[PDB]
Amino acid sequence: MTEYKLVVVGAGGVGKSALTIQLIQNHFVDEYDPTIEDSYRKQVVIDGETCLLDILDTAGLEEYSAMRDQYMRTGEGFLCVFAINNSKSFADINLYREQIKRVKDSDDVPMVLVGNKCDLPTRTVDTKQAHELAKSYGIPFIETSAKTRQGVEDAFYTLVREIRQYRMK
Amino acid sequence: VNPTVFFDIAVDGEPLGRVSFELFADKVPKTAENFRALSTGEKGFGYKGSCFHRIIPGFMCQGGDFTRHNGTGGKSIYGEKFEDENFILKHTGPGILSMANAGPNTNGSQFFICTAKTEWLDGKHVVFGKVKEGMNIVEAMERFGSRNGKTSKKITIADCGQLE
Ligand SMILES: CCn1c(-c2cc(N3CCN(C)CC3)cnc2[C@H](C)OC)c2c3cc(ccc31)-c1csc(n1)C[C@H](NC(=O)[C@H]1C[C@@H]1C)C(=O)N1CCC[C@H](N1)C(=O)OCC(C)(C)C2
Ligand SMILES: Nc1nc2c(ncn2[C@@H]2O[C@H](COP(=O)(O)OP(=O)(O)NP(=O)(O)O)[C@@H](O)[C@H]2O)c(=O)[nH]1
Numbered sequence: 001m002t003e004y005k006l007v008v009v010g011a012g013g014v015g016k017s018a019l020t021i022q023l024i025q026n027h028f029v030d031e032y033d034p035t036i037e038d039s040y041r042k043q044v045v046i047d048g049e050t051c052l053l054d055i056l057d058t059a060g061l062e063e064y065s066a067m068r069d070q071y072m073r074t075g076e077g078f079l080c081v082f083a084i085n086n087s088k089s090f091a092d093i094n095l096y097r098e099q100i101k102r103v104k105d106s107d108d109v110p111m112v113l114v115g116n117k118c119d120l121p122t123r124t125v126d127t128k129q130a131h132e133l134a135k136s137y138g139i140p141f142i143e144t145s146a147k148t149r150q151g152v153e154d155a156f157y158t159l160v161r162e163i164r165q166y167r168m169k
Numbered sequence: 170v171n172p173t174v175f176f177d178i179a180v181d182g183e184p185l186g187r188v189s190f191e192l193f194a195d196k197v198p199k200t201a202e203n204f205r206a207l208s209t210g211e212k213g214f215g216y217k218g219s220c221f222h223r224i225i226p227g228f229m230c231q232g233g234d235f236t237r238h239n240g241t242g243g244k245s246i247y248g249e250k251f252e253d254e255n256f257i258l259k260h261t262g263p264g265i266l267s268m269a270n271a272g273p274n275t276n277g278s279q280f281f282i283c284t285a286k287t288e289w290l291d292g293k294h295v296v297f298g299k300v301k302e303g304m305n306i307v308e309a310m311e312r313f314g315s316r317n318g319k320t321s322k323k324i325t326i327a328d329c330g331q332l333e
């Protein structure tokens with residue numbers, strides 16, 4: 001059974017942990033519990049193959065921006081998360097992507113852009129803005145809500161598909 | 170005179186020992202008074218019975234969530250949260266007692282005790298006390314921690330209050 005090392009990154013509070021806990025535990029809590037570092041494992045079937053997802057949930061707290069190199073070298077694919085009601089988190093996306101490409105020394109790193117919190121009415125990042133950023137990276141863009149579960153499986157599973165294609169090229 | 174408070178620490182309900190703290194009321198009176206009142210329980214709520222939910226060897230022991238008991242709660246005697254009083258005191262070494270927070274001006278009841286110098290927290294967390302007696306108790310708590318802070322035994326404030 002093939003294992004995939006996924007890493008969830010993005011600005012603090014965008015919903016990295018809410019998304020991961022919704023995938024793993026099938027529930028959502030509104031309390032804020034900022035992450036130090038957490039790891040999870042989940043077996044899934046994607047396109048008829050059994051996959052084992054090893055998921056690293058990372059800290060968004062910008063104070064520790066200098067301590068990402070090691071997990072970026074180890075990770076095989078990245079869920080790059082912003083919140084659709086937080087324009088600064090959307091600007092932060094490009095810094096994460098540049099850091100990952102810098103650290104892995106490659107323009108060709110499996111990634112998915114995730115715009116989370118789409119259940120909210122107070123959108124400040126329009127969907128066209130995000131689609132064009134993702135198009136310019138050559139990567140998928142998926143809108144999600146960890147609160148309603150909209151798009152949650154699709155985001156993680158698409159990233160697995162991106163890693164799969166990178167390996168079978 | 171600066172007040173002194175104590176915690177009696179237990180591990181899975183078995184006593185470990187007493188830690189006492191000097192509270193720097195002379196430098197941060199509002200922050201020291203919050204911690205003092207929560208240690209006596211005199212408002213009808215406070216630290217007694219709560220746990221150290223995050224222990225990271227080499228860095229700190231963090232506790233004080235007596236409202237949700239999951240690391241996300243707590244409240245001050247002034248309301249849910251209160252402002253950063255000042256940043257005069259620094260995280261100089263083991264035994265420093267300082268406020269946890271969710272960013273600027275979000276002090277509640279959660280606190281941390283340093284087990285090393287943590288100078289990058291200077292100007293971000295309000296230092297307001299230090300361990301006076303029982304630093305070896307804090308050192309003994311570290312082995313129940315882990316890299317990300319999850320504890321392997323339940324570390325509780327079995328009793329607490331103010332010393333004369
Ligand atoms: C990169 C990995 N990492 C690290 C880290 C940093 C280093 N170095 C930094 C200094 N250089 C010179 C050497 C290397 C090495 N190793 C690690 C860890 C062990 O690697 C896994 C930290 C950290 C903190 C947060 C997120 C990720 C983090 C975080 C996430 S929320 C936070 N901080 C602040 C926290 N608010 C809360 O709880 C809110 C919920 C309540 C109301 C809070 O008020 N307090 C009190 C002060 C201490 C802080 N908690 C905390 O736990 O600090 C952990 C510590 C290990 C001290 C720092
Ligand atoms: N409405 C809504 N709220 C969400 C959603 N995802 C997360 N939240 C809320 O946003 C806050 C931050 O969520 P969290 O998952 O802790 O964010 P994070 O990216 O893991 N933070 P950190 O980087 O500090 O660990 C919480 O209050 C959480 O309930 C979502 O899809 N919709």
Ligand SMILES: [Mg+2]
Nearest residue numbers: 016017034035
């Ligand atoms: Mg998180």
